[PDB]
Design a protein around this nucleic acid. Structure first.
Ligand SMILES: [Mg+2]
Ligand SMILES: [Mg+2]
Ligand SMILES: [Mg+2]
Length: 95
RNA sequence: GGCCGGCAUGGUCCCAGCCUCCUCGCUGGCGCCGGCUGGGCAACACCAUUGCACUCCGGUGGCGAAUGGGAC
């Protein structure tokens, strides 16, 4: 499904075989064009693998990145994007 | 990776080859057979997982592996 707009986009269906550091970098490579990125959170734990949170400084960036990159073939798999259900700490830690 | 027992095996050195979860080594290891046993998930493989976080954190596996020449 999905939710309300947010500064952060929740990505899943990501190739689980890629290491944390490389995954982070390839994501900046792919998403930096949509706007400034505050951070990318990735974990390879049993619950969080195959998922990533890309935190943009501006919601419009997240909105554009979500429309443009939906299903983008990344590491041989169709990337799935939704707005994150809750604000990330970096974002709340500001406003 | 460690230890043990059996059979085998003349020594020292040189070169090359090979092996590998104990990285690969410029203090590595490498005769045949059998048994006991340690560490670790860091890498790799498989299994399982489609998962909404801001706390590093599923499991199993392999090391049950690896030889030729020369000089004295
Ligand atoms: Mg004996
Ligand atoms: Mg001789
Ligand atoms: Mg010889």
């Amino acid at each position: 499904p999905e939710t309300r707009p947010n500064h952060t986009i929740y990505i899943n269906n990501l190739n689980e075989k890629i290491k944390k550091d490389e995954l982070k970098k390839s994501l900046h490579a792919i998403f930096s064009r949509f706007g400034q990125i505050l951070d990318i959170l990735v974990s390879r734990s049993l619950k969080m693998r195959g998922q990533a949170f890309v935190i943009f400084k501006e919601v419009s960036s997240a909105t554009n990145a979500l429309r443009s990159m939906q299903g983008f073939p990344f590491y041989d798999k169709p990337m799935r994007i939704q707005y994150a259900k809750t604000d990330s700490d970096i974002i709340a830690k500001m406003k």
